[model samples]
Target: MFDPAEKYKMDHRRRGIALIFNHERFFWHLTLPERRGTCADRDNLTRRFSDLGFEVKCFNDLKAEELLLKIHEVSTVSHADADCFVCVFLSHGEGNHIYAYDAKIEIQTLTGLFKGDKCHSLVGKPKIFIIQAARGNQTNITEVDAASVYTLPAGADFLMCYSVAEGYYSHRETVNGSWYIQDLCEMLGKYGSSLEFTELLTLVNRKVSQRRVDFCKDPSAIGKKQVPCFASMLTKKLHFFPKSNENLYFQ
Candidate 1:
């Protein structure tokens, strides 16, 4: 088992953080535009990270083309190599992927853009992606329920965190807040100064279990559940705010 307590010390560190958020709004929608599908959690999330002192760069309401451009821009704009890059995507999605404006982008596409060879700015650092979206809204009537858990491939150096397991419904309140992001932000806000990233995820899992429960009682009913999945592909250990031989959260 990996131990943050043994791996990180509180006084020796040299790294920086980059946060990116994307909110997609259909240009023609009227009246309840933002409320239609409920996908602005990224904006709020970006602000939260900014407040926490990460050099935050948030991109709101971008189409696929724009998103690509922004990715290229930010990946090359800075001189100080970023230590970690965080990206939160809140939007409609299908199984194993998400929609970028009017087009569908496999999760790997955006992430693959940051391979150690391509985006050298963040080489050897953690690349964290927090995605909140339903894998697919259409449920299949199959003989058995399918599982959505999978292991991270070797040498990928990425950790992809999902709001819900695959084939599950990811919930959001148009005005109140998104369950995944809400839990994430609340936990981060309260314990970010003292908790390890993985530790914080455990709290998020607990909160989601308590907060979400399906009310239906039939087999045909869709089982609503929320739990963040962590796909860790790093050969080395990753910490959001690593301190010298200490895992103290950034203050």
Candidate 2:
């Protein structure tokens, strides 16, 4: 029901790259428990986003240095011909930091690389980041559970998706992957091209909230629930009109 001026231009030469940073293993001293089902989550997202028209790239268990360097490389590239940009993070985190394999990193350090004119080619294009962080067995003895950090650049086109709401831990089954991501992937595969991005996310929130631990090995986590949330700074209704599967008559 909106005009072209009110909607983000999704009809570009390409839909842009989706960079997924998935970390499971950690250093012997870090004590970060392995995220067992994240590979399924990562692969599922890769396939769904691949069908949505992005150049999907996955990075697994990179050190902090490698993490920053890879994202830095991404932020410096020219996206003049692309429709939008996307990034995904699957790791353990707290307060304003997401853990890399070897260390905790400020969320700003990775997002700052694309701020304002730093990545001029993506100036007006949508920049979306999805985060699925589970705190595992670690506790922040020094401080309370801080809210997810919102450190976007001074711009209008942005959206940040979180697996859990403020002060909550995201859930993952050893075999079924994460609650939020699986629901999200399912929704995207079902209605990605038909519905707006935010609309699809709302369905994901609904689906994730309806899931309960019921019976799991982690008794402390049993019966607990999670709801996905998103912060939208988008100036337009973002839609991914798929072009790849159009008019396919395969043998």
Candidate 3:
């Protein structure tokens, strides 16, 4: 049986890449009024990941084509000496498609670029994607015949996390940013160097679920809650800091 929380005891002294895609505006001169707080998320993630010993790269407001291009460009690079790869997409989305300023692209397409065969340098290494988007027009498929059956690959070390449940809205404040990212940053800032990866995510999940968002400032919006969801294909206990330098990783 596969245990999602099984810890991978490994050293990540100066390994891995953290790529951030922050889409706050559209390519057609339109703005996303609801994403006013995304800037904070971007800035916070960059600093936090860097402190965790990741080399971070941030791209803001890329068009769909440019998004794909950049992802492909990043994927083709050699991660031969890296321990893991992290990608965060903060954007508007419909169903499983993420918006890239000018257009929409399936989340799978972006992730597929880093598959075991596609990016051999990342094979058997963690590839984490943290997606913050709305789940719009979701579908429910209850039955599957043999001809329609599809199985997710089991050979990859991947983790996909979403900010909200399916077919629901994720909330953000005008000043504080999205609930999930804020909590994630805080959790990482406090525990990134010592806690295991799954342990950190669990705390982030708990904090996000307890938050209430009402950017509209209406009383009715006060009860809206977000539940962070995740799927893991991780096979080991993953940690950011090396055992010898607990304080050094964060500094």
lDDT of each: 0.59, 0.79, 0.72
Candidate 2 stretches greater than 4 Å from native: 1-5, 138-155, 214-218, 244-251
lDDT of 3: 0.72
Best by lDDT: 2
Model 1 misplacement above 4 A: 1-19, 27-40, 78-81, 135-155, 214-223, 240-251
In model 3, state the lDDT of residue 190.
90
TM-score-superior candidate, 1 or 3: 3
Query: Model 3 over residues 35-120: C-alpha lDDT tens digits?
Result: 66788889988999988778899999888788888899999988876778999988777655777888778777778889888999
Better of 2 and 3 by TM-score: 2
Q: Estimate each model's TM-score.
A: 0.73, 0.87, 0.81
TM-score (C-alpha, index-matched) for candidate 2: 0.87
Q: Which parts of model 3 have CA positions greater than 4 angstroms off?
A: 1-9, 28-34, 135-155, 212-216, 243-251
Better of 1 and 2 by lDDT: 2
Q: Write the per-residue lDDT of candidate 2 for residues 115-195, one digit (tens) a residue.
A: 666899888889898988756564211111223543333346878888887655576766668777889999999999889
Model 2 Cα shift for residue 92 (angstroms): 0.6
